[PDB]
Amino acid sequence: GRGKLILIEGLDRTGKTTQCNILYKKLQPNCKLLKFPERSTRIGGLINEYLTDDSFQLSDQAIHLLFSANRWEIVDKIKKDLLEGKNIVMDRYVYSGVAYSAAKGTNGMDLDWCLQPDVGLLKPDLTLFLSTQFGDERYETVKFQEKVKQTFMKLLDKEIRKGDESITIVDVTNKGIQEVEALIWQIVEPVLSTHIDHDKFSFF
Amino acid sequence: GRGKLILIEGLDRTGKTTQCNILYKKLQPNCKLLKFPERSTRIGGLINEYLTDDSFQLSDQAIHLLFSANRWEIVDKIKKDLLEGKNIVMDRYVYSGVAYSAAKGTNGMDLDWCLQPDVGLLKPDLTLFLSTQFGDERYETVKFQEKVKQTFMKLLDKEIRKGDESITIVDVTNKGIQEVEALIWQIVEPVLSTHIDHDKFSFF
Numbered sequence: 201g202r203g204k205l206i207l208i209e210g211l212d213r214t215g216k217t218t219q220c221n222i223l224y225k226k227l228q229p230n231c232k233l234l235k236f237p238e239r240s241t242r243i244g245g246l247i248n249e250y251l252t253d254d255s256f257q258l259s260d261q262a263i264h265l266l267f268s269a270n271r272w273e274i275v276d277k278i279k280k281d282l283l284e285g286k287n288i289v290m291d292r293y294v295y296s297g298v299a300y301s302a303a304k305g306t307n308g309m310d311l312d313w314c315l316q317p318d319v320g321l322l323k324p325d326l327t328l329f330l331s332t333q334f335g336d337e338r339y340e341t342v343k344f345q346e347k348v349k350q351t352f353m354k355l356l357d358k359e360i361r362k363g364d365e366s367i368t369i370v371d372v373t374n375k376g377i378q379e380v381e382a383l384i385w386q387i388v389e390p391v392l393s394t395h396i397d398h399d400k401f402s403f404f
Numbered sequence: 405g406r407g408k409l410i411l412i413e414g415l416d417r418t419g420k421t422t423q424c425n426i427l428y429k430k431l432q433p434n435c436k437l438l439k440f441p442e443r444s445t446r447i448g449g450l451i452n453e454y455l456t457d458d459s460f461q462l463s464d465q466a467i468h469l470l471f472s473a474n475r476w477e478i479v480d481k482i483k484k485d486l487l488e489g490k491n492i493v494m495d496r497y498v499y500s501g502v503a504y505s506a507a508k509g510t511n512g513m514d515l516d517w518c519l520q521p522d523v524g525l526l527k528p529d530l531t532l533f534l535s536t537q538f539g540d541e542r543y544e545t546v547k548f549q550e551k552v553k554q555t556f557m558k559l560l561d562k563e564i565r566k567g568d569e570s571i572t573i574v575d576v577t578n579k580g581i582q583e584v585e586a587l588i589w590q591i592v593e594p595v596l597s598t599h600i601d602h603d604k605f606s607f608f
C-alpha cells in the first residue's frame with residue numbers, strides 16, 4: 201500500500217534526533233526524514249528568529265500559529281510521498297506544537313485552543329513518545345522543560361484514554377543508543393509490515 | 405471609562421477605507437487608525453508577498469493562520485490604547501479573515517475551522533458592515549468577490565442568531581461619500597458616549 205508516517209516526540213535532548221537519524225538510515229532508500237520546525241522556509245525563518253533571538257518579541261499566540269502554519273505549508277508534500285510508497289520519519293509535529301505552547305499557562309491558550317490550528321492535518325500512523333525520569337534557544341531552561349514534560353504527559357494520556365492506539369510511550373531512562381533503538385524497532389517493524397490502503401489516512 | 409473599538413468590514417472597493425479615514429479625522433486627537441492586514445511587521449511582510457505576488461505559493465491553511473497571527477501580534481497594543489482612553493478605528497479584522505478563507509471552499513476550511521485561531525481576540529465594540537447589491541492583488545477577481553460576499557452574509561447572519569447586537573449592516577448602494585458618512589455617524593455617536601468600564605471587554 202502506501203508508506204507509513206512515523207513520529208518521534210519528546211523533550212529536547214532525550215535522544216529524539218539521534219533515534220530519528222538511526223531509524224531513517226535503516227529504512228533507506230524508500231524513506232524520507234522530516235524535522236519540525238522546518239527552518240528553511242520563509243515561515244520557518246521567523247520561527248528560527250524567535251527561537252534564537254529574544255529581542256524578537258512575538259506574542260504567544262502569534263508564534264503558536266506560525267508553528268502550525270509551518271506544518272501546513274509542507275503537509276501536501278508529505279501526503280504525496282506517502283502515496284508514492286515512501287516511508288516518512290518525523291522529528292516533532294503536532295504534539296510538540298500543543299505541549300510547548302500550553303505549558304506556558306497563557307490565558308486562553310489551553311490544550312483545546314492549542315490543537316485547533318492543527319485540526320485537519322495528517323495524523324501519524326505511529327507516534328513514539330520518548331520519556332525519562334543548551335540555553336541557546338528560548339524554551340531551553342530546566343524549569344520550562346519540566347513544565348512541557350508535564351503537559352506532554354497530560355496531552356498524550358488524554359488521547360490514549362480517548363482510544364488512540366497509535367501512541368506509544370517509551371521509557372528510555374538509562375538505556376543506550378542501541379537499546380533504545382531495539383525498543384523502538386520492536387514497535388515500528390510490525391507497523392511497517394501491516395498493509396495500509398492508498399486511500400486510508402487519519403487526520404487530527 | 406476606556407476608549408471604544410470601532411470596526412468597519414466589507415468587500416474591497418466598498419468605500420470602507422475612505423470611511424475609516426473620515427471617522428478617524430472626526431475622532432482625532434483621541435484616536436488611532438489600524439488596518440489589517442498590518443503589512444509593516446515581519447509576518448505582515450509574508451502576507452504582503454503572498455497578496456502581491458502569485459509566484460509565491462502557500463497553502464490556504466498556512467496563509468489563513470498568518471492572517472490570524474498578524475492580529476495576535478498587534479492585539480496587546482490595541483488593548484493598551486483602549487485602556488488609556490483612545491478610540492481605535494479598524495479597517496478589517498476577524499470577519500475578513502474567516503470570510504475570505506471560507507469562501508475558497510477548501511476541504512476542511514469551513515466557517516468553524518476558520519474562526520478558531522482568532523478565538524480569544526478582543527471583540528470590537530461596534531462592527532459596521534458596508535454592503536452593496538484593482539486586480540493587482542490576489543483575491544481581486546469579480547468571481548471571487550461574489551463568493552466572499554455570500555460568505556460574509558452567511559457569517560454575519562450567523563452571529564446575529566447567536567445574540568451579537570454589535571454588528572450593523574449598512575447598505576451603501578448608489579450612495580455618496582457624505583451620505584454614507586452620515587449613516588455611519590448615526591450609529592457610531594451613541595456608542596462613543598455609552599460608558600464602558602476600564603476593564604470590560606468582549607472576546608471571540
Ligand SMILES: Cc1cn([C@H]2C[C@H](N=[N+]=[N-])[C@@H](COP(=O)(O)O)O2)c(=O)[nH]c1=O
Nearest residue numbers: 212236237267292293296297300339340
Ligand atoms: C515543531 C514544534 C516545536 N516547538 C519547539 C520545541 C523546541 N523547543 N525547545 N527547546 C523548538 C525547537 O525545536 P528543535 O530543537 O527540535 O529544533 O521548537 C514548538 O514550540 N512547537 C512546535 O510545533
Ligand SMILES: Cc1cn([C@H]2C[C@H](N=[N+]=[N-])[C@@H](COP(=O)(O)O)O2)c(=O)[nH]c1=O
Nearest residue numbers: 416440441471496500501504542543544
Ligand atoms: C485582514 C484580512 C484580509 N484578508 C484579505 C482581504 C483582502 N482581499 N482581497 N482582495 C486582502 C487585502 O486587503 P486590503 O486591500 O484591505 O489591504 O486581505 C484576508 O484574507 N483575511 C484577513 O484576515
